[PDB]
Design a protein around this ligand. Structure first.
Ligand SMILES: *OP(=O)(O)OCC(C)(C)[C@@H](O)C(=O)NCCC(=O)NCCNC(=O)/C=C(\*)CCCCC
Lengths: 73, 403, 360
């Protein structure tokens, strides 16, 4: 929503290897990839994301909902 | 004709019993090994349950090797080996300078020791505060050499096989090959691991640690509990066993190894299937002769789905009964497939199939008969023990009934 | 050559002498020294000097994909595998199939990986805030599995421990599985990474007043085949591998018994030994190993190959570097043809191992 998005983009990109918003999936992807991104977000923000919410972390944008939800943003 | 190899001794240190009698009673009861963690501090993990061995007393089983020469996994390995040789009724005359193989499988070895060293460093802010006694005993090769030292057997090839969650079956298989080569007539084989912070955090981080219980092949399964212990099997030439009037638990028929050469962590249905086929071929056994399968069956989403598929790929629409001993033990890592193998031996000897416990509803993607929640009496003659690990390592073992 | 004898038909090495077979045979012919100082990037270390692989950066050797979190131990093994299997252009020189085994010897895998994992578990805000991408690389069997993925090797895939004897445990394992029909060829070797955690653990283990450890690293690999089907000219036949555990804290006695057994099984006398390479550990144990062999083999056998101590203590790499040294000295001397080499290693966890080769 603000400069958090730019830090989120940067985390994702480093963990899945691309550099353009947008799906997960048809675009590198690997269940390990998605775990590396959930793990990076958790550490960034000292939050806990429930790992049963991995099947919903698709676009550079559906993961924002998750991050923000679990973060109480 | 190839050499016959039999199982004359079982040494068991597990979360559901110490020694063969207690372990057998456990298996027949669907006893669970789940209990609170006592070995490290779980604050911040959000859960506190594992399948520890509750009341280990090393000084009871270990008489020659100083206790501080070994971490916990080594102590489990030596204790179980002493128990196995006693269960086999072997004397000094049967051992001593006798040429033998000792092969122990491990995933984590003395990882707890590695964590305690790191604590000493962090607490002081200084690597110089680390204990030399710990630093000297962290290398996995020690898990097999200490057995030779305890039993006073210098003419031993002491190999620690570090193929992680498949290591017990690899070690038993090595023992079989070693004896069928004619180069030795006796091998002590199995696996050992100890509960540690590393394994617990690892599975937590991968989202593969159950919040409650292990439910292999269940529709709503949520992963493993970490476990520990040791299983050591005495493998012996039939000729040696009969010459000394040994009681034979069961016979080792064959095994198979395969590599997925695919993914670093994900299991592979084609790789698993190949391992099963190579094992059936080595054992000289047709698919129809298998009474049941002891599945690797960790209770993860990916494992149980893929393993079920491989089994159906090999056996077709009506596979053998397929059970998961980790439902009771949790995941004892390197020890898992060795404890599984011993369960299979005991199933053959005593005529029962151990249950998949904590079972509520079979996954539609896992169309097996899992023998839910209670053991069944059955005419058990030939049994398949599956194992697999990260790095695409697969090892499948076939046991059979002796005479 | 007895009915189904394993033969080495190829080798490769990544070592303190540099990257590749060529660099290694050059190091050996020259008896070069390899000790340098350590990148202050590694952070504080116990000792000044190291025998690192010169000019080995992971992303450089293996490219920028899936390598950023890779451990040095895996990377060394993968490059040694490229050395063994690929021609100068990067296409397969060596045909493999589903009957090609892999077995690698190690000490305790990547201590850097595991201690970095645990360090972050202990120090980050939640104890499961660990680097998920590094987890696969922490497995003791990762290197051998990575080799199988790299080169499409679906056959038997095994890792064994044992430190300094592990190359010979690996060789014996391969020999036995080949003899039982589980593989037709094998990649066999061993490997050790240098790291800060390894340096500090070795330091912690060393008695006050004993010499500071000088630590090496690298990987050596062999291609092994059955004599009577070799797709290639045999470099050496493996006639025996014998092992013991020193249970009486007398390494010399163990070495002597182990060597004698090995020669007896090989059908050979101590007198026929052309080359004998001990592991030369910088200990009283290493000195005992040397003296036991000197009491056994011709003194020319012990002077035929330069000292392993130039490489530093290479840990699990030791016995593979020792076999490779025998092969390099075999090559630069056509009088080797048909003569016996003996390789010997001792590890501080109790084990001794001896292999007897016939050079071709
Ligand atoms: O691949 P994916 O995208 O579905 O998700 C990644 C994870 C969740 C890691 C998935 O790959 C997975 O669950 N892998 C393991 C599944 C399993 O249980 N496999 C059996 C392999 N056996 C083991 O027993 C593991 C042993 C412990 C190794 C730790 C060594 C340090």
């Amino acid at each position: 929503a603000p400069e958090r998005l730019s830090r989120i983009r940067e985390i994702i990109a480093e963990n899945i290897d691309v550099d353009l918003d947008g799906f997960i999936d048809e675009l590198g992807a690997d269940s390990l990839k998605l775990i590396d991104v959930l793990s990076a977000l958790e550490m960034e923000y000292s939050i806990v994301i429930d790992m049963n919410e991995l099947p919903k972390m698709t676009n550079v944008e559906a993961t924002y909902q998750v991050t923000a939800a679990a973060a109480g943003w | 004709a190839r050499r016959r190899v039999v199982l004359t001794g079982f040494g068991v240190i597990s979360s559901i019993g110490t020694g063969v009698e207690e372990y057998t009673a456990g298996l027949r009861a669907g006893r669970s090994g789940a209990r609170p963690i006592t070995r490290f501090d779980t604050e911040g993990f959000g859960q506190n349950t594992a399948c520890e061995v509750p009341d280990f007393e090393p000084g009871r089983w270990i008489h020659h090797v100083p206790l501080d020469d070994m971490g916990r996994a080594g102590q489990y390995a030596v204790a179980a080996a002493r128990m196995a040789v006693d269960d086999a009724g072997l004397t000094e005359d049967d051992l001593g300078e006798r040429q033998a193989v000792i092969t122990v499988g491990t995933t984590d070895g003395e990882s707890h020791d590695i964590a305690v060293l790191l604590e000493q460093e962090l607490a002081a802010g200084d690597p110089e505060a680390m204990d030399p006694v710990l630093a000297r005993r962290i290398n996995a090769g020690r898990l097999s050499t200490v057995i030779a030292r305890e039993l006073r057997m210098p003419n031993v090839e002491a190999t620690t096989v570090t193929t992680a969650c498949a290591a017990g079956n690899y070690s038993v298989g090595y023992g079989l090959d070693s004896i069928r080569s004619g180069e030795v007539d006796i091998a002590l084989c199995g696996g050992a691991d100890a509960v540690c912070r590393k394994a617990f955090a690892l599975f937590k981080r991968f989202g593969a640690l159950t919040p409650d219980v292990v439910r292999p092949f269940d529709k709503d399964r949520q992963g493993i509990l970490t476990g520990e212990g040791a299983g050591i099997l005495v493998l012996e030439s039939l000729e040696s066993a009969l010459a000394r009037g040994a009681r034979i638990h069961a016979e080792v028929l064959g095994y198979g190894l395969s590599c997925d050469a695919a993914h670093p962590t994900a299991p592979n249905r084609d790789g698993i299937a190949r391992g099963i086929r190579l094992a059936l071929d080595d054992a000289g056994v047709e698919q129809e002769e298998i009474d049941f399968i002891s599945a690797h069956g960790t209770g993860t989403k990916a494992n149980d789905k893929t393993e079920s598929a491989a089994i159906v790929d090999v056996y077709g629409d009506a596979p053998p009964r397929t059970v998961a001993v980790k439902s009771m033990l949790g995941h004892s890592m390197g020890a898992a497939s060795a404890l599984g193998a011993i369960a299979c031996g005991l199933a053959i000897e005593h005529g029962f199939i151990p249950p998949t416990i904590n079972h509520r509803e079979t996954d539609p993607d896992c169309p097996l008969d899992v023998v839910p929640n209670r053991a069944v009496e059955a005419d058990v003659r030939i049994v398949q023990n599956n194992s697999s690990a990260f790095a695409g390592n697969n090892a499948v073992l076939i046991l059979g009934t002796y005479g | 050559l007895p009915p189904g004898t394993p033969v080495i038909t190829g080798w490769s090495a990544v070592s303190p002498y540099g990257i590749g077979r060529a660099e290694f045979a050059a190091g050996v012919r020259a008896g070069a020294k390899t000790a340098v100082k350590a990148d202050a990037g590694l952070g504080p270390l116990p000792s000044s000097d190291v025998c690192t692989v010169p000019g080995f950066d992971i992303q450089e050797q293996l490219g920028p994909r899936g390598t950023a979190k890779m451990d040095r131990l895996t990377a060394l093994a993968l490059v040694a595998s490229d050395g063994l299997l690929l021609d100068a252009d990067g296409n397969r020189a060596v045909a493999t199939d589903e009957l090609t085994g892999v077995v690698l010897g190690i000490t305790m895998g990547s201590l850097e990986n595991v201690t970095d994992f645990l360090r972050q578990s202990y120090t980050n805000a939640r104890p499961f805030y660990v680097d998920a991408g590094r987890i696969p690389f922490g497995s003791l069997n990762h290197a051998a599995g990575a080799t199988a993925i790299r080169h499409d090797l679906k056959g038997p895939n095994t890792t064994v421990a044992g430190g300094r004897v592990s190359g010979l445990l690996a060789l014996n394992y391969a020999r036995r599985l080949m003899g039982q029909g589980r593989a037709t060829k094998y990649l066999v070797g061993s490997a050790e990474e240098f790291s800060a955690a390894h340096a500090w653990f070795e330091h912690t283990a060393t008695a006050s007043g004993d010499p500071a450890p000088l630590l090496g690293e690298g990987c050596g690999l062999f291609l092994v085949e059955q004599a009577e089907a070799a797709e290639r000219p045999p470099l050496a036949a493996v006639l025996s591998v014998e092992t013991r555990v020193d249970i009486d804290d007398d390494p010399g006695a163990a070495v002597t018994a182990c060597a004698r057994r090995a020669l007896r099984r090989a059908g050979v006398d101590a007198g026929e030994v052309w080359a004998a390479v001990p592991c030369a550990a910088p200990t009283a144990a290493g000195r005992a190993e040397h003296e036991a062999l000197a009491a056994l083999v011709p003194a020319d056998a012990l002077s035929r190959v330069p000292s392993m101590e130039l490489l530093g203590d290479t840990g699990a790499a030791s016995a593979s570097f020792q076999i490779a040294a025998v092969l390099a000295a075999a090559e630069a001397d056509a009088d080797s043809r048909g003569r016996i080499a003996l390789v010997c290693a001792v590890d501080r966890d109790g084990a001794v191992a001896v292999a007897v080769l016939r050079l071709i």
